[PDB]
Amino acid sequence: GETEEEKRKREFEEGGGLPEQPLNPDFSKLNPLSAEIINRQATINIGTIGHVAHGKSTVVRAISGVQTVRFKDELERNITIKLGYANAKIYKCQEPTCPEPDCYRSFKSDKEISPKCQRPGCPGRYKLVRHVSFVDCPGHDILMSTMLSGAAVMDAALLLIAGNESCPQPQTSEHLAAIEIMKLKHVIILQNKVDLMREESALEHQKSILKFIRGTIADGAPIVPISAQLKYNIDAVNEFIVKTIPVPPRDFMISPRLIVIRSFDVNKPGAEIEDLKGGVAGGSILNGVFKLGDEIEIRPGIVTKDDKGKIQCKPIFSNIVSLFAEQNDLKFAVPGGLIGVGTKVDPTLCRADRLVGQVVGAKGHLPNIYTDIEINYFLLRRLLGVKTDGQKQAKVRKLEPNEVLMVNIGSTATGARVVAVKADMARLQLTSPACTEINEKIALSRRIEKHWRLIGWATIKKGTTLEPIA
């Protein structure tokens, strides 16, 4: 007659629990799969791409179980602007007796080190293969910037294609191309609607999918039939995540950095101000390991215009108060995983859309803000995301001087003007400041049919820098 919660608590204490991270472990010997790292943080970033109104938060919620909220009155239903998140722990059974396809099992972040095998007749316990983070990306035509920013944050990709609807959906193609731009060659393909399809209709859809992916850079992407609502065939997807995606080369040698993508203010209404919390930068750390009590500065920071109209940038210095990742407060944060850096930064500085696409540097490094960025760019032959009613696809036109283009340097959302166009080179002047550290992968888009349309790729090779005022 034990309550369900008592049973879950007993299973949690028997399952290994949630360990507390050592306050000072030997770092050069810390691998992304170590227990101190794996049981409490997500080390590999996994994203979902697709056309609008097919269900990507549905698939992620079926996989892990952490909801993506989908907030803001009107945005509960139509579209979302912020990315969706969810922590998934991939567990595989140690018992060789239970068949491999159903060995894997993805659970929430709160799960124990070794939960029991829920397959009937299997007494063995699960082993944590890897912890992964899920970056849900709103797949709409209007919303371009966040898709490219997340794709920069991403490390592996999952493309969603519906069954009954038209085969060559252009948004899926655009997202796959954008993924190919930012050096992501690990994608697994999922057919979201199979239950409503016939045995031959599904085969025709698969043949169309193969026909579509022949001229793309990714060639041997595995294809998976999945059900988002029916909640089936997830263990196999966990298997494919384990097999086809290895760990990107990432060690602690690289200098510390950070890239804020979302911005969270911790101000619970109704509570007295004498008990508050700091301002949180939701950031992806692709390089650098951050600890408690580390001073860090937001380089593009305060953007101001002088009386003459000149652009001044005041870097936003900050002391790290906490590094919240996954579920528990953790001493060290593994680079390559979305983490909330809760610093003492002003809560209003983090209200909704303030720290979105902003590079941040730990003390001991001086990244440079640029006003002029000269880029090496390259284009495609036909636009993606446009449905032409039986005619040639819209062909990319060459760049014109003095034109506004959405240039996404990694995460930084900037609208650049062109000073000159060359055979392989171009020059861009930016209104919203952007900082450069090494090269940063950049995406280019222009305004032709009302909203932004991706055009090609580019990389900064030089630029004019502005020494920040301290």
């Binding site: 549905t58 595995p222 039939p225 609502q229 065939n233």
Partner: protein, 134 residues
């Protein structure tokens, strides 16, 4: 190579067939009962039970599309007004299209529930998260 794809497709089809071997044409014939300046819908309980919607919400939607007020007796709705079965059938079909029938999947198992204060109808056959309140 798509060899490791179609296999899971076959397993999914097998699971679909085993769990749901059955896989609406069950809308009651609308009996509009016109008493001169009065209208009676006596079968409203049968429609409400044959579409798995509570009669209270159906009557509210009726008095949202139709700008009148009526009384409930016993199961039956009486509205003192002259109206055709054409418009009753059309409004029933539209309600089924946006309330009784799920938009993502062709099913009737979905029911009206609540998730802070908005009305969130949720599905039972699959379990989707939709909203139809306005």
């Amino acid at each position: 190579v798509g060899l490791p794809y179609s296999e899971l497709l076959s397993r999914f089809f097998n699971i679909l067939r085993t769990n749901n071997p059955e896989l609406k044409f069950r809308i009651p014939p609308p009996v509009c009962l016109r008493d001169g300046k009065k209208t009676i819908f006596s079968n409203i309980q049968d429609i409400a039970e044959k579409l798995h919607r509570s009669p209270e919400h159906l009557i509210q939607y009726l008095f949202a599309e139709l700008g009148t007020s009526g009384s409930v007796d016993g199961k039956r709705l009486v509205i003192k007004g002259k109206f055709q079965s054409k418009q009753m059938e059309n409004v029933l079909r539209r309600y089924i299209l946006e309330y009784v029938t799920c938009k993502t999947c062709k099913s009737i198992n979905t029911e009206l529930k609540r998730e802070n204060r908005l009305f969130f109808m949720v599905c039972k056959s699959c379990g989707s998260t939709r909203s139809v309140s306005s």
